[PDB]
Amino acid sequence: MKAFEFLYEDFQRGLTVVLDKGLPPKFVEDYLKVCGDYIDFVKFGWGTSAVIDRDVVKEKINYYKDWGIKVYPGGTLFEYAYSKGKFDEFLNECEKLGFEAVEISDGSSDISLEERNNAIKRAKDNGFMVLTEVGKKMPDKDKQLTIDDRIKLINFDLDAGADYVIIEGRESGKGKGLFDKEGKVKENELDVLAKNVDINKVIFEAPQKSQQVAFILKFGSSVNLANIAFDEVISLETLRRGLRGDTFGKV
Amino acid sequence: MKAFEFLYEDFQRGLTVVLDKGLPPKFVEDYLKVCGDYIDFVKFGWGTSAVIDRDVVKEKINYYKDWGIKVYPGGTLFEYAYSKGKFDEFLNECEKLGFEAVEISDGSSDISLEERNNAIKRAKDNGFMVLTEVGKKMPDKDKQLTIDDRIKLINFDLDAGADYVIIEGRESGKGKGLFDKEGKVKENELDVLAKNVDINKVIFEAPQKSQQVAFILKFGSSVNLANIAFDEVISLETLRRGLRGDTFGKV
Amino acid sequence: MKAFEFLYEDFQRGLTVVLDKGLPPKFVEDYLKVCGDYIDFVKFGWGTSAVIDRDVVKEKINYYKDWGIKVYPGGTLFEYAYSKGKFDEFLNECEKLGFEAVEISDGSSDISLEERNNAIKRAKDNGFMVLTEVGKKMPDKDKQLTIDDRIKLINFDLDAGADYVIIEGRESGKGKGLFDKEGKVKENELDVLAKNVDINKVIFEAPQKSQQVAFILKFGSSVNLANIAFDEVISLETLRRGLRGDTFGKV
């Protein structure tokens, strides 16, 4: 039970996906005792997994598993392996390490629709949950994706068997996807998503508190959010509950 | 004893109040071995307490108690409970969990002077230290408070039995209270406080290092500061001692 | 071995120097199991050492030593001790605590060339590795140092027996040394360094990810970097390896 349980009001709580960019192992064990109940998935950011000791990676995945949290490596790592013709070795290693999900992305590389479709299907066939990601890392490339382009890709990924589709904003949440150079949500672009796709299948990267607030006020506390800093999981739950100033009386 | 004890010069050290927005329990135990000697009070930010496991909350309060640190829940949580007519249940739970203090605020809700006075007195009557808070969360509301308004409220709260009064700046320290949109201290507004209230009874929220520096240079190292990030307690003590560049030779 | 070891490509990896501004002791023990292999040196920032319990300082130095990491106190602490005529007591305490290196700087105080030369030599004579630092803490003083001034001081310090010379940018990485008010690298100033000094003897403070990216793209992954946040050591290694978006395919 929570402290002040008498104040709790039941609600439809969206997904929380954390960015883990290299948390220490015992720290993860400790940390989950405070906020493990509010984490659904964790991304080991980009290629961070590939720099960490193999047993430490396995260890961490188990700690998350003790709280029912599925872990995936970043799509950037998939893209690196894919570009080297080592996608199979990538899936095999993922299975051996214990990742329950994989992210398929094309943020840093050119992957055709057919290649993308087939990578999703191969990952699914191997028993992984699959999250895809729509967006490009670099602003010159990302700018070439219109909102209608993003919508088409979301539904393409779902058709291929993706479980969820992530809308990219990077850890910075600046100048990429739905966010302008100052990190403010592009309201018009976001409306065109709200009316064209199944929002329950979409996860919005929202690393900044101001972004989390904007998404909660627009879609409700049922909104799915990703790239949540590990130390803002509790904050995010308070925002969903109207127990932080930004959403008090508004949720 | 401290390392390099021969360099230490005794001084009048103001209060340090930390923002704990959800630190893990064993981490707190470990963390206090480094900087517990420089923490007076800790705020479990806003309604964070109300999302955390009850035994974990109790556990953390005890760890802080082992270093002589008093803990209070955020005034935002008080405001939520108060607005639901559950202030009594709120005080009872606070006592059961072990909080030694409570924050009374009106940052997100309308609380009249009489209601405010009576809430302070009720908390005091129940054995809590009471810290009040002056300010509004949202800039449209906060702007309506003039400096003279803030001064009047400080002394009203003290009259009611408040132990300390906190000047609100939020965790961001931007666009609220004494800080402009860029987080810079409003020097003129601050002078009008320096000459009209007992500064020893006031605690300034100062989440940004630049704010801590501004307050130390204005009032001295005896200044009371709040919303100090957990990982900047040591930094803050070095600033008070002139052992970081910003205050070297100036304190 | 690392996870996804089959993706690893050997490369010339520059130094990583971490800023430790007060990490808890058991946290350090845990933290090094994830990224201790990618840390060469750690700076206990400025005078932080002088506020921490002496046995905790010794304890931490040992944890770092278990991963082959040398620790030094900040040059600001040296400057304080030096200004009080307690440089000898400073070196003795450093030896007793277990620091394997010392930083000699003049960021907050006036130290002549002869005084600087002699302090370097005294530290070396006492068995310390010596890192010096070029730059001033305050922008009004730092602006008076031209690039040619910095180059001359680098080689002066090396002549005196310095092991490395650090180019100062502070923890903020703003408005000081090679960085403008917005934290962007001054490309022209940096070119004049690239062509005039032994870059292998220089360590660039680069607290911001954007700075780390700029230095890696300019000098390569062999570049030496300092003031790396403890939680960005893994990120930095991924950047060196082209496994984060910013340097994917560029390294």
From Swiss-Prot, chains A, B, C:
Class of enzymatic activity (EC top level):
lyase
User: What GO terms in the biological process aspect are recorded for it?
Assistant: coenzyme M biosynthetic process
What InterPro entries does the entry give?
Answer: Aldolase_TIM, Arch_ComA, ComA_synth, ComA_synth_sf
Further comment: The enzyme is stereospecific.
Q: How does it assemble?
A: Homotrimer.
What job does the chain carry out?
Catalyzes the addition of sulfite to phosphoenolpyruvate (PEP) to yield (2R)-phospho-3-sulfolactate (PSL).
PANTHER family, per database record? PROTEIN HEAT-STRESS-ASSOCIATED 32, PTHR48413
Enumerate the UniProt keywords alphabetically. Coenzyme M biosynthesis, Lyase
Q: Highest taxon of the source?
A: Archaea
Q: Which reaction does it catalyse?
A: (2R)-O-phospho-3-sulfolactate = phosphoenolpyruvate + sulfite + H(+)
Family to which this protein belongs: Belongs to the phosphosulfolactate synthase family.
Q: Does the keyword Membrane apply?
A: no
Q: What is this protein's record name?
A: Phosphosulfolactate synthase
* Pathway(s) the chain acts in: Cofactor biosynthesis; coenzyme M biosynthesis; sulfoacetaldehyde from phosphoenolpyruvate and sulfite: step 1/4
Report how activity changes across the pH range: Optimum pH is 8.5.
- E.C. no: 4.4.1.19
GO MF terms here are:
phosphosulfolactate synthase activity; sulfopyruvate decarboxylase activity
